Design a protein around this ligand. Sequence first.
Ligand SMILES: *[C@@H]1O[C@H](CO)[C@@H](O[C@@H]2O[C@H](CO)[C@@H](O[C@H]3O[C@H](CO)[C@@H](O)[C@H](O[C@H]4O[C@H](CO)[C@@H](O)[C@H](O)[C@@H]4O)[C@@H]3O)[C@H](O)[C@H]2NC(C)=O)[C@H](O)[C@H]1NC(C)=O
Ligand SMILES: *[C@@H]1O[C@H](CO)[C@@H](O[C@@H]2O[C@H](CO)[C@@H](O[C@H]3O[C@H](CO)[C@@H](O)[C@H](O[C@H]4O[C@H](CO)[C@@H](O)[C@H](O)[C@@H]4O)[C@@H]3O)[C@H](O)[C@H]2NC(C)=O)[C@H](O)[C@H]1NC(C)=O
Ligand SMILES: *[C@@H]1O[C@H](CO)[C@@H](O)[C@H](O)[C@H]1NC(C)=O
Ligand SMILES: *[C@@H]1O[C@H](CO)[C@@H](O)[C@H](O)[C@H]1NC(C)=O
Ligand SMILES: [Ca+2]
Ligand SMILES: [Ca+2]
Ligand SMILES: [Ca+2]
Ligand SMILES: [Ca+2]
Ligand SMILES: [Ca+2]
Ligand SMILES: [Ca+2]
Ligand SMILES: [Ca+2]
Ligand SMILES: [Ca+2]
Ligand SMILES: [Ca+2]
Lengths: 385, 385, 385, 385
Amino acid sequence: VILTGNSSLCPISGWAIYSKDNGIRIGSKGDVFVIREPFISCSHLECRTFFLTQGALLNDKHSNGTVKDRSPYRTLMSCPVGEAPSPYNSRFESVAWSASACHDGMGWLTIGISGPDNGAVAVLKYNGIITDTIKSWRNNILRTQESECACVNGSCFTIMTDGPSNGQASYKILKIEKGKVTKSIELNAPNYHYEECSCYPDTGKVMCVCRDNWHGSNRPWVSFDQNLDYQIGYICSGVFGDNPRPNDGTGSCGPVSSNGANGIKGFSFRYDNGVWIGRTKSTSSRSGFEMIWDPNGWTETDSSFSVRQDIVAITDWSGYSGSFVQHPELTGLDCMRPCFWVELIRGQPKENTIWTSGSSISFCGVNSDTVGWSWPDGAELPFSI
Amino acid sequence: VILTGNSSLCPISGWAIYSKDNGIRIGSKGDVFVIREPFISCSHLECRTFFLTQGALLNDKHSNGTVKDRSPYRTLMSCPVGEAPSPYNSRFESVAWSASACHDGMGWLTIGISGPDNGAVAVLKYNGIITDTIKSWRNNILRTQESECACVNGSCFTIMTDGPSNGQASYKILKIEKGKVTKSIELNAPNYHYEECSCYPDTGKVMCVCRDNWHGSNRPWVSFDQNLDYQIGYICSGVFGDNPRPNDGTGSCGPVSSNGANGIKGFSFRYDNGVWIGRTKSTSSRSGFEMIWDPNGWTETDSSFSVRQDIVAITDWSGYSGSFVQHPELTGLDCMRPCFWVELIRGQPKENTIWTSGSSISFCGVNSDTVGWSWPDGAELPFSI
Amino acid sequence: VILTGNSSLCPISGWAIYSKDNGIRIGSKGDVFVIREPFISCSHLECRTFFLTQGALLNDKHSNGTVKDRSPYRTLMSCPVGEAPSPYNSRFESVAWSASACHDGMGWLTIGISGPDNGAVAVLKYNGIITDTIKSWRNNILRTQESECACVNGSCFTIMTDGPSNGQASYKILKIEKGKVTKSIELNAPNYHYEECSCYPDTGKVMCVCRDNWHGSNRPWVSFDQNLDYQIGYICSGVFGDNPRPNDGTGSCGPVSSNGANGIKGFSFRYDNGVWIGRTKSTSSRSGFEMIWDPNGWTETDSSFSVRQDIVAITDWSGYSGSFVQHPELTGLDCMRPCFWVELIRGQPKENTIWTSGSSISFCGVNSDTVGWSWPDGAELPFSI
Amino acid sequence: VILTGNSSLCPISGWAIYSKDNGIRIGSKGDVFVIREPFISCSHLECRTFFLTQGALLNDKHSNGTVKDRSPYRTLMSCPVGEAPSPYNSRFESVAWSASACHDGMGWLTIGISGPDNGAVAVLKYNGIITDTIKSWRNNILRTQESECACVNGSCFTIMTDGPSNGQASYKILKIEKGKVTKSIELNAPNYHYEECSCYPDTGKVMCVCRDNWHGSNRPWVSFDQNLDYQIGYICSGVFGDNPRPNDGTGSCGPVSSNGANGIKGFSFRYDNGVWIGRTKSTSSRSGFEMIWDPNGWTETDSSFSVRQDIVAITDWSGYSGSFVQHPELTGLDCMRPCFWVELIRGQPKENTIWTSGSSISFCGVNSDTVGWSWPDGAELPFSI
Ligand SMILES: *[C@@H]1O[C@H](CO)[C@@H](O[C@@H]2O[C@H](CO)[C@@H](O[C@H]3O[C@H](CO)[C@@H](O)[C@H](O[C@H]4O[C@H](CO)[C@@H](O)[C@H](O)[C@@H]4O)[C@@H]3O)[C@H](O)[C@H]2NC(C)=O)[C@H](O)[C@H]1NC(C)=O
Ligand SMILES: *[C@@H]1O[C@H](CO)[C@@H](O[C@@H]2O[C@H](CO)[C@@H](O[C@H]3O[C@H](CO)[C@@H](O)[C@H](O[C@H]4O[C@H](CO)[C@@H](O)[C@H](O)[C@@H]4O)[C@@H]3O)[C@H](O)[C@H]2NC(C)=O)[C@H](O)[C@H]1NC(C)=O
Ligand SMILES: *[C@@H]1O[C@H](CO)[C@@H](O)[C@H](O)[C@H]1NC(C)=O
Ligand SMILES: *[C@@H]1O[C@H](CO)[C@@H](O)[C@H](O)[C@H]1NC(C)=O
Ligand SMILES: [Ca+2]
Ligand SMILES: [Ca+2]
Ligand SMILES: [Ca+2]
Ligand SMILES: [Ca+2]
Ligand SMILES: [Ca+2]
Ligand SMILES: [Ca+2]
Ligand SMILES: [Ca+2]
Ligand SMILES: [Ca+2]
Ligand SMILES: [Ca+2]
């Protein structure tokens, strides 16, 4: 079965909780990896949590977070959804300090980038076998989504960036077939900035909503078809999606400069001219999380919206978030089901531990009754080491 | 295979021991979850122990019981029968502080309720994919069986309660097909109280034996067909089934008010006008466990009975108990085999630890020789943390 | 595939090492069960180590060996051959303080005996489902092989004893089909004593070599066909097989009274009128292990033998041992392959620890070059707890 | 599927990183074996890391290295590629202090040598069942590759050595079919020394590149067809491959005596008259690792080469290395893909711990962009015990 990716997003009214791994609470006693970016992705049969570890465990000296983000120890691993990430239940995927993965209906594509800042190489694997490599073309931290790539009709698609994180960089869409890059195109996107894209399939095409780290407090997006014919823009809503950001106000269909530098990985789902935005509750801190339905927020610049669903209270830490979908081949539905995950970051810099790790929660969009609450990390810091 | 559920309960003379997990003894050293309600449910292929954890391990500070029962950390997980519940051998099922699960012959249905007390939502999954949600209709702690739902002819059935635990509440039967609620009905049950139902299939219908927490020291029951045409009553026997309860005496076919407030999850099996009652040995404490065959105990109020089989000595702690069955599709038999599990609760409030957990034992009904004994938890408390 | 069991034992010249689990060395740090009787048994696809645990781990207070042997905590579990027995890699089989198991080509038969000394019940399971029970018929510690039962042509066979361990008892052969006892017969064996039988299939029949705990320092045997037509005797060799025993000398075809009380589980393989005897090296202590080929030792009473192969040095602890076979269905050979396991007992009474546990080694008989050595337990006692 | 082994080595330009297990970093906290020789071998379906352990974990007294290398505790185990080797994720293979393994397309062959120095025996298993044994013919430490054997057209091939490690010894090629030795031949190799061969299939034949521990600082090789018709030589390049070795200079097609005694397990791949050499960066210490393409280095003695790719910095410890391939049956390619693993040795004798262990990295040859870097072990020594 190759996933067709021809269905449109399911009608939904809210988000039902799908998983919670309690990774950090468990790792207080058990043998649990220090991780970041616990992104979920699914096949036609099952869903997995992928994550990066520095190959060190919680409550151990090697968790010391003074290690560079881009270290030769960092690996992409995966485990079943909702389980603490341990060396006893986790599969090895790739050596990587930046990553993506996705399933085409027949096999897993994993992308793991390692190597030096001035010449990083993405290693592509299909079913665990190396199938291609892509080397840095600007010699400045080649990097990718940190969430699932999107697959449509036997090809999978991702976005890579190379260049400054605080100025204009270079952005490419990649089309990958059975692990081999068969087409790419560079975005002609002066004055845009794309990092950490959350990309999903929709009606035979792909939509990516990303992080502008340079000068936008709204999120950039890029959409494209199977030929890589693309469109670009920013989400117009004055309900700003990045962190940090200003208070809600008048939005822009280009980058909103106020509080624009820096950011956080996030996602949104487009429905017609409306948008579901996932975002932190705080405008300044990685605290809280909420889903907002703004029925004209993709294309209109007002700050009005119609629904807010609480996910994590502003008094609790949140973190990266990303989209994942469940295809009809998996669910039996006739539409593409949107879901998202949230990383709940504990430790440095906000808290007095030697380490930084995340646990995770995830939700799927449903057209049935839901409720807002807070499902935070719950660990009591610090630990013993 | 869909399980037909048309067979009648097997003839039995007693109970043979099926499993014992020694979870707490093992958790003295190993990495074992703090758990409650270790209920068993089976498919046509295998049996699993489902349970709720606070996402915390024994011998760790996060096991501190002062965590509310209905926390955002609580999850429904499952592991193979008879194994200590560890993060290294347990599958994640649902985020949940009250739960049920059962298999229809084709896939697992799990029901996990989380959210706030005033608006809890049951997330239903079939084969791990969200298929439906049910929101609180009385805004007062929507809650369910804490043991296996019952499946007959491709539909599965459960009971949910919403409302006070110390007065009249609202009780609904749900009919669920491939994880979708296809029918429900509210019980017209003034003066009844239903919590924590133990429900099993028998001859194409379902029988549930429950807990009256309001004003009954005998157990309420509800039985229904596939259309949800129901009957209700209380077990008539003067061999009282709840805990606490009075000394055995004259029963009632309605709620027995003496020592009626409070209670414990339990079960019973009806055979004609007779009943197999599982109950604690103490009338005041959650201590001991025994099976009693009262050949007229379903419909008659005398305190006479004919067989007692010891399961746990009165000098050892017991706890919740529930029914599970093994269908002909699993066993090759021509009848529905009754089994039960018992939770052996250690820690608070009866013991001086920061935590409360249970281990489990289980037994199956056989028409061959058996013996009474005591198979208690066996852990020596307190632990280190 | 049902195993035919019609082949005769393979011609062999010696024993090649098959496994070593290093369980106790590993359990110095890892989470490893305290176990006894690590017996191996195989299907047509794989081999497993079965074992009894008190549901406690090494380096923990619950390993305190003052617990009765026959406790309600004892369980029969299994794990893959050669792996340390941990709660993370072990399957639960049965609640049991005496056990046997074997595979008929279609499913696993497990037999676990629990309950009180005066009324123990063996629970039989086939594919994990209870299929029969057998209750004590002399009310005096019903007990069985502690090694694999033997299967021939769709039936499996075992020996149970009930009665004194220091005088005449009662011995029965059981024939079991898909987990159900279909025939049994009591041995007419005045002045014999049978415990802890090691039974293997050979040419459509079964041979058991056992432990006389009453008054024999040679080993009793019983052989029988599928109808339970049986023969009994003792191994005639003056190379005495039990522990304790006298120095080698003139044997007897009945029980050898010198040093006859007490014993150890062991095994031997009959070839024509000759015998391979596995035995401790010490006549008085459970120390060392060796395989002896005595070409007339089944029926002749001299103390001459022709081959000795060292297995464990006399300076290292040994313990229980038993036979297992690999059938043609597994191996592809045209003969029945004999193997054996040895339990290497550490701790009490010989050593200053609170616990007693065994690790294991195993060997298979080959007709190719082999070597004698010592493969002892290797743990450094005591541990920390 | 039997692997044909008829394809030729893939064209490559460099090495892409395939795995890194961080075993020692993880073992600082988790339950991880002390291991050596973590060699990779693949089937038509998956790849595994095989290794030898002393049956002891990191951070435990049993890791005390003073245990002889050739102990009765040493076992060959395997785990998935890239996972820390733990008792909870590792399969038992053989009792062994020297080993090989490889898959023929239908099943795993493992070879494990144990026993005394004067009479060691190789136990061969196919699909885990003993199929043959080979006893020492010179009575002086029978020993084998410590990396994967090579399979071609349903036969698998290995090299064993028996005799001195510091003078002339005896070297045999074995041809093994379904775990049975069907042919062997002794190398007529006066003045050669072969240990620890790294052997791979190429165009229906096998090439082995080995370690001369007697008097060669270049590497000996032996190649042979399916009939065991062989050729022998040494790698001619003045880019010397062993450790220790002299500075690069004029090579020889026979053993280079300068710094020739001692050595390290390593590998090289022949392409026409050229060679990819993997070697330590230091000439005196087991430090660093690099791949060197010398386009005439198989047959010509100059010290010129054309490509160097860094793998481990000279400031970090390396260790043994070996070849493994991925056959077309696994990859879908039309050529035989070369890969290699490196063992990163920590502890004694270079570091102040009681133990010695390695972690691993591995790379596969690709004809696409790659990059040099350093991917060292990363553990901070000493540990607690
Ligand atoms: C398991 O959970 C239990 C419930 O949370 C814990 O019990 C609680 O422990 C805390 C200690 O932090 C205690 O807090 C208050 O104790 C005093 C009230 O009786 C009060 O004087 C304290 O106030 C002082 O200290 C705090 C610092 O935390 C300052 O903010 C104040 O300014 C002041 O200096 C404090 O508020 C709780 O009373 C107690 N709760 C209950 C319900 O008993 C257990 O400690 C925990 N067990 C384990 C083993 O960890
Ligand atoms: C890892 O293994 C190493 C090798 O086994 C250990 O080193 C050995 O430690 C032992 C201590 O038991 C030591 O034993 C002898 O030490 C003296 C010789 O130099 C000698 O005086 C001792 O004799 C005395 O003590 C013994 C009791 O054991 C009595 O029998 C005697 O009567 C006398 O009172 C003793 O024989 C070894 O010398 C030493 N071996 C070597 C080769 O250096 C390490 O201890 C171990 N490391 C860890 C961390 O455990
Ligand atoms: C962590 O690493 C940094 C940099 O190497 C060092 O300065 C610091 O002391 C370390 N902290 C701990 C707790 O080991
Ligand atoms: C073990 O148990 C016995 C009997 O209960 C007791 O006497 C002894 O003190 C215990 N030992 C330890 C170390 O706990
Ligand atoms: Ca920004
Ligand atoms: Ca709007
Ligand atoms: Ca009550
Ligand atoms: Ca009655
Ligand atoms: Ca531990
Ligand atoms: Ca005896
Ligand atoms: Ca003789
Ligand atoms: Ca050398
Ligand atoms: Ca050259």
